[PDB]
Amino acid sequence: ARAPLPPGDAARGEKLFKGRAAQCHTANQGGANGVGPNLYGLVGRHSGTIEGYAYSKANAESGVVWTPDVLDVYLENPKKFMPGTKMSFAGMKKPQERADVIAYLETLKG
Amino acid sequence: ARAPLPPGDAARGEKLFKGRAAQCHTANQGGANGVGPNLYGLVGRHSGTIEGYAYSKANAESGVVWTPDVLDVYLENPKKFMPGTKMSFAGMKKPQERADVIAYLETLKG
Amino acid sequence: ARAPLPPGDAARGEKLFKGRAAQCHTANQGGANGVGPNLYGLVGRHSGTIEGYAYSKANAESGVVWTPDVLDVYLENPKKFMPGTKMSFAGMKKPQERADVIAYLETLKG
Amino acid sequence: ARAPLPPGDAARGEKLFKGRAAQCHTANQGGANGVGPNLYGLVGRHSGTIEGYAYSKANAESGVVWTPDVLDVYLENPKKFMPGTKMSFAGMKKPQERADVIAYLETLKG
Amino acid sequence: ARAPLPPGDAARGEKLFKGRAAQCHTANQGGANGVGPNLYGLVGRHSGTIEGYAYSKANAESGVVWTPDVLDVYLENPKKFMPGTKMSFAGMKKPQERADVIAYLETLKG
Amino acid sequence: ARAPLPPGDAARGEKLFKGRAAQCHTANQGGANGVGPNLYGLVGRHSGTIEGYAYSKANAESGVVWTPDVLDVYLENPKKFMPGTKMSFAGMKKPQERADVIAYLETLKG
Ligand code: HEC
Ligand code: HEC
Ligand code: HEC
Ligand code: HEC
Ligand code: HEC
Ligand code: HEC
Numbered sequence: 001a002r003a004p005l006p007p008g009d010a011a012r013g014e015k016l017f018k019g020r021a022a023q024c025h026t027a028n029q030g031g032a033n034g035v036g037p038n039l040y041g042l043v044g045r046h047s048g049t050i051e052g053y054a055y056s057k058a059n060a061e062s063g064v065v066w067t068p069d070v071l072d073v074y075l076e077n078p079k080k081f082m083p084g085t086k087m088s089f090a091g092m093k094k095p096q097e098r099a100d101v102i103a104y105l106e107t108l109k110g
Numbered sequence: 111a112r113a114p115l116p117p118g119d120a121a122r123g124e125k126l127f128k129g130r131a132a133q134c135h136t137a138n139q140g141g142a143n144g145v146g147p148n149l150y151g152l153v154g155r156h157s158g159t160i161e162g163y164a165y166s167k168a169n170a171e172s173g174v175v176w177t178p179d180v181l182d183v184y185l186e187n188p189k190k191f192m193p194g195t196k197m198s199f200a201g202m203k204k205p206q207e208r209a210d211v212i213a214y215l216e217t218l219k220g
Numbered sequence: 221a222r223a224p225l226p227p228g229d230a231a232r233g234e235k236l237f238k239g240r241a242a243q244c245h246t247a248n249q250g251g252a253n254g255v256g257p258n259l260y261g262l263v264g265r266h267s268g269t270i271e272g273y274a275y276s277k278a279n280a281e282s283g284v285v286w287t288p289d290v291l292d293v294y295l296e297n298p299k300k301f302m303p304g305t306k307m308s309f310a311g312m313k314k315p316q317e318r319a320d321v322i323a324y325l326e327t328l329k330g
Numbered sequence: 331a332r333a334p335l336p337p338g339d340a341a342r343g344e345k346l347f348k349g350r351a352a353q354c355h356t357a358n359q360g361g362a363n364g365v366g367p368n369l370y371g372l373v374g375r376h377s378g379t380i381e382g383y384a385y386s387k388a389n390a391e392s393g394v395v396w397t398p399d400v401l402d403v404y405l406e407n408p409k410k411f412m413p414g415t416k417m418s419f420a421g422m423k424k425p426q427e428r429a430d431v432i433a434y435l436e437t438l439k440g
Numbered sequence: 441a442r443a444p445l446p447p448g449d450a451a452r453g454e455k456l457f458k459g460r461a462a463q464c465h466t467a468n469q470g471g472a473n474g475v476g477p478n479l480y481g482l483v484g485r486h487s488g489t490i491e492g493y494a495y496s497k498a499n500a501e502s503g504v505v506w507t508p509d510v511l512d513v514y515l516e517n518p519k520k521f522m523p524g525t526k527m528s529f530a531g532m533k534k535p536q537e538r539a540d541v542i543a544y545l546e547t548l549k550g
Numbered sequence: 551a552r553a554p555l556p557p558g559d560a561a562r563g564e565k566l567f568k569g570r571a572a573q574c575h576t577a578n579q580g581g582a583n584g585v586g587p588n589l590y591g592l593v594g595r596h597s598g599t600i601e602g603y604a605y606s607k608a609n610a611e612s613g614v615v616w617t618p619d620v621l622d623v624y625l626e627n628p629k630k631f632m633p634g635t636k637m638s639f640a641g642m643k644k645p646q647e648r649a650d651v652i653a654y655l656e657t658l659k660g
Binding site for chain 2: 569570573574585629635636637638639640641
């Protein structure tokens, strides 16, 4: 069983997002796929279904829903959570940092 | 059979290209590969042969020639046309926009 | 357009199947997957959906229905029809042999 | 709660193994790789390390140990447990049959 | 620089072939592809070109010619020679055994 | 004999790097993965191990050390050196340019 995350701060999460995700992921409504998929409205989505994106077999078949609890374990270590993913991200060790990024992703709605 | 496209406008095509392709594709002569291949001189080329580019099995084996009529069907829905492609683009569903992009691609020569 | 096939003979089809497919494909009801999927009840099926089978991206995404006319084109040259397939079969180039195999596949029902 | 893994019968297990697995997997000491890896001494192994076998990225990176409890969940639905696997097996859907196969696997030691 | 192999014995090589390759590879003229390609007339062939076979990217692109010197190093350890191959064979440590198998492959002509 | 690797100019190397590599590869300490991995401290590394990067099977299994002499051969033609790589780079075909880039890479240390 995992610890719950501390409350996330979306402004800190945006800063972390720009530093750690933005070169592969756009975050704006209608933004383009690139190395990775656009992430607007990611939170709560069924995995492997962003419009236009061609996923690995692992991510296509992964069958999770991206709620914050699932994002927490995934973002800690993507390879461990989803072996076979083509997302080239080692992970974020710090619980507050993961909480902040998740809180930022949560604002990508409207 | 396929409905013909309307006449394309290259300037609108360029605008559409920069909004919808430019983050994966360069368009200048001798431009680099990135997410996707450089597209200078694309139109009329045998598929899966751009200098330097490491294609999916599907795109390497595809055996088409990118004439305008073929580009029409492909750009409407890449996954339907070339299942197994790693091009993360859903397609352009509006005939005029598809025609405009094709008209732009046609200018990439000299 | 496609030249029609001659009428197939299922008994010749079975002989051809055992010589050219049987080492990758079972044909009995509830037969197992191996190199390739079990083919009982193949004809008329949506492509890439046989119980249990782990397909290539190309075959998973292919979106055809294996009607006889589609099987004709596919079995003549699988790589041309479905570039990116992992089916290691060059094709049957003789119309009568292709028709016979199709006639055999059509018997796999009940 | 997940159903407790029932006591397995190894003789029934072998019967189930030969009907559902043997076309891809050998079970004898020093038996060959084929579609899937030789499974002698599988129980207790780190995943994705059987001598000579070229795994999918998902199975190579899976990082589990094949204890009986892990096999229970995996064998029920391989695709759910290991999305991205190339193992073409839908799963042992009946819990007693699944337990019997595990009991058979457990005997492959010496 | 490698040692030359000792003279190979084709009868011993056939025995080794049946024990170590035959479940993935046929050896007869006109024999079928299976897990791996038919190997009749393999010796001296450009790599990645057997009729009908769908290779990994690595083997498709490998650009070697299968002369006995190249078969020697490859068969010792396929992964080391061709990283990314999907051939699930660890290798043969013993120079006489590799020589024998190569001498057997050399007879697959006529 | 293979041409000796000429003395490289690192400033010319950086210029060549920014024109030919930077769209896929960062070069700064702690820079992000993108299309390809961050290359800080690349020289002398075991291949296929840069933190966070999800490699092709060929690059993951490559088993080389990126000394300058190995980089020379690789960078001349990546596809020839590492068949199966997903690096979309045809190669540095001019030996002085190839040496300059290596000299630049050598400076990425501290
Ligand atoms: C490029 C080097 C990336 C970095 C850095 C990050 N991500 Fe990523 N991501 C990337 C790819 C190529 C993919 C698809 C993976 C596949 O196996 O197909 C992803 C996927 C995600 C997902 C899942 C999307 C879905 O299921 O629809 C999420 C939620 C995601 N990525 C988020 C994410 C975050 C929060 C990152 C840093 C803080 C991050 N990614 C880094 C490519 C890259
Ligand atoms: C990144 C998310 C991409 C976007 C958006 C678009 N393209 Fe693309 N394209 C991309 C990749 C990775 C590839 C290779 C695909 C593979 O399976 O190997 C491609 C391929 C093409 C091709 C074919 C090139 C060839 O056969 O040589 C064409 C003609 C092409 N792409 C054009 C194109 C256009 C016109 C786009 C939007 C208007 C577009 N692409 C989007 C990556 C991405
Ligand atoms: C092994 C060397 C094979 C031989 C010979 C043949 N088939 Fe095959 N087939 C094989 C594989 C591995 C797959 C999956 C391909 C993938 O890319 O995922 C297939 C697929 C088919 C299909 C499609 C099934 C579906 O969409 O559900 C059909 C209809 C099919 N194969 C039929 C077929 C016939 C009639 C053959 C010879 C007469 C034949 N196959 C040869 C493996 C191999
Ligand atoms: C062919 C159609 C298969 C059938 C039926 C079964 N297995 Fe399998 N298995 C197969 C492949 C190709 C692989 C490698 C998968 C990959 O993604 O690389 C596997 C893998 C396993 C493993 C894991 C081995 C390891 O981690 O070292 C186990 C434990 C395993 N298979 C067992 C198993 C059992 C018990 C089956 C039926 C009762 C079964 N497999 C079916 C190919 C096929
Ligand atoms: C299944 C478990 C295999 C065993 C055992 C052996 N081989 Fe194999 N081989 C296999 C596959 C799936 C492939 C294609 C690999 C790819 O990456 O695409 C191969 C390939 C070869 C080749 C190269 C063929 C070519 O380039 O055209 C050769 C020469 C070869 N295999 C020979 C060989 C020998 C001599 C073996 C044991 C003594 C052997 N293989 C074992 C599958 C399997
Ligand atoms: C994108 C179009 C690229 C260009 C241009 C270049 N590289 Fe690259 N590189 C890229 C990818 C996607 C990968 C991973 C390849 C895989 O098969 O997994 C690489 C890999 C390298 C490596 C090896 C890294 C390692 O083993 O850890 C090196 C040393 C490397 N690339 C260097 C390099 C140089 C010097 C380039 C131009 C001068 C260059 N790359 C171009 C993507 C792309």
